[PDB]
């Protein structure tokens, strides 16, 4: 019944403007204050400050002095979050929350991540990893596909169509530049490969690719 | 600021047992107004917070009663009787006594299961690679439990590397266990200067490490 509704994701360039809006609703929108919260990727929480509904009036911690304005549209509700002359470290998901008396952050929004980057849509290379053929084995053989270079997040790896999940190690995309990086290992019994083909399935959707990588001994 | 210590960082429980972690503040949380304002949220993995404990003890609507808030001044205990899969997260404990309001670090709750060493695999830049004058060396640190883990590169035997990517995944939702995936990345000709590449694996399960090597060939 109470909720506070978060504008959709945003990716931006360094040194431009990104506007985010919080929509409250199932009470009253000015009897209570509004928070914002920064969650860097993979970090903790840290308040920005707040504004106060009935007087508009934003207050920012020195953290985020300078560049950040909170405001009002207090006929519809809203809250929002502009950040000015964006930098990498501005990437993060905001969120905003609602006061009660007993605690300023009772009800929370779903948040919003800005992306900051200056990358172009680019399609991951993908390579395979597989061991020497005459590589001594076990009853198990590890597999992967290495996928270097892409931008934006995400891409989408399956082994054999999803016919092989409960083997996969799909690790996080991580910044190797302006662009992500993962990999993807699979393990199977040596009985099963190579005697029947293992394939990793990668989709980009953003670049409208998908590659398929047989894997081979190598 | 209130610095808001949050012990442990990382708290290994078992479902159907009870759990403990300690928040504690570097002065009293106890407001002139009489009231305390001690707050728990709870974040799932790819969700986000959600209220849990205010002033210290009162749980919010909805909130399970498996959760119990206590404590006073600069001491606080969240408690929860009987852990189930959904109380997996990050706790965070956090102030509104003293501005600027102030968060714990958090505290993240795992499933305990049995020590496992890592089955380590490396893999040469593939052909293809090669190809586009890229040399990507991949190792795989698999299956291993607890989660905390170190790897090192060395080149022709000396402790040393380029550009090194180092990827690790949250808890295995199958058998409770962690992997890492490390990957040194150079120039196919800065490849071709050196023969000898090793991923040397340390991890609490054996005073020595697992190296696992390759000879460019």
């Known amino acids: 019944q109470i909720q506070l509704v978060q504008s959709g994701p945003e990716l931006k360039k360094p040194g431009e403007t990104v506007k985010i809006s919080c929509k409250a609703s199932?009470?009253?929108?000015?009897?209570?204050?509004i928070h914002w919260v920064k969650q860097a990727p993979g970090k903790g929480l840290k308040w920005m400050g707040w504004?106060?509904?009935?007087?508009?009036?934003?207050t920012y911690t020195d953290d985020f002095k300078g560049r950040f304005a909170f405001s009002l549209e207090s006929s519809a509700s809203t809250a929002f979050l502009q950040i000015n002359n964006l930098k990498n470290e501005d990437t993060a998901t905001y969120f905003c929350?609602?006061?009660?008396?007993?605690?300023?952050?009772?009800?929370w929004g779903q948040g919003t991540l800005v992306t900051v980057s200056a990358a172009k849509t680019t399609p991951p290379s993908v390579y395979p990893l597989a061991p020497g053929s005459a590589a001594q084995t076990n009853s198990m053989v590890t597999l992967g596909c290495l996928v270097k270079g892409y931008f934006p997040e995400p891409v989408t790896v399956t082994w054999n169509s999803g016919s092989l999940s409960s083997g996969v190690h799909t690790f996080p995309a991580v910044l190797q530049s302006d662009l992500y990086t993962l990999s993807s290992s699979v393990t199977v019994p040596s009985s099963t490969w190579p005697s029947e083909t293992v394939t990793c399935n990668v989709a980009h959707p953003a670049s409208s690719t998908k590659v398929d990588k047989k894997i081979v001994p190598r | 600021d209130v610095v808001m210590t949050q012990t442990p960082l990382t708290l290994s429980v078992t479902i159907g047992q009870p759990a403990s972690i300690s928040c504690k503040s570097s002065?009293?949380?106890?407001?002139?107004?009489?009231?305390?304002?001690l707050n728990w949220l709870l974040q799932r993995p790819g969700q986000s917070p959600k209220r849990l404990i205010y002033?210290?003890?009162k749980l919010d609507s909805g909130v399970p009663d498996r959760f119990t808030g206590s404590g006073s001044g600069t001491d606080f205990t969240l408690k929860i009787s009987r852990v189930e899969a959904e109380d997996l997260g990050v706790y965070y404990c956090?102030?509104?006594?003293?501005?600027?309001?102030?968060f714990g670090a958090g505290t993240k709750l795992e499933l305990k299961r049995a020590d496992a060493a890592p089955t380590v695999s490396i893999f040469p830049p593939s052909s293809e690679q090669l190809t586009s004058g890229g040399a990507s060396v991949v190792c795989f640190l698999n299956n291993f439990y607890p989660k905390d883990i170190n790897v090192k590169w060395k080149i022709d035997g000396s402790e040393r590397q380029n550009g090194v990517l180092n990827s690790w995944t949250d808890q295995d939702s199958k058998d409770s266990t962690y992997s890492m995936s490390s990957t040194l990345t150079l120039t196919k000709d800065e490849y071709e200067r050196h023969n000898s590449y090793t991923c040397e694996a340390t991890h609490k399960t054996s005073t020595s490490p697992i190296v696992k090597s390759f000879n460019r060939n």
């Open positions: 929350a609602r006061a009660t008396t007993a605690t300023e952050l009772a009800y």
């Open positions: 199932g009470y009253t929108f000015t009897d209570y204050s």
């Open positions: 504004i106060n509904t009935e007087t508009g009036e934003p």
């Open positions: 002065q009293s949380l106890l407001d002139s107004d009489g009231k305390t304002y």
């Open positions: 002033l210290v003890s």
């Open positions: 956090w102030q509104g006594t003293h501005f600027p309001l102030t």
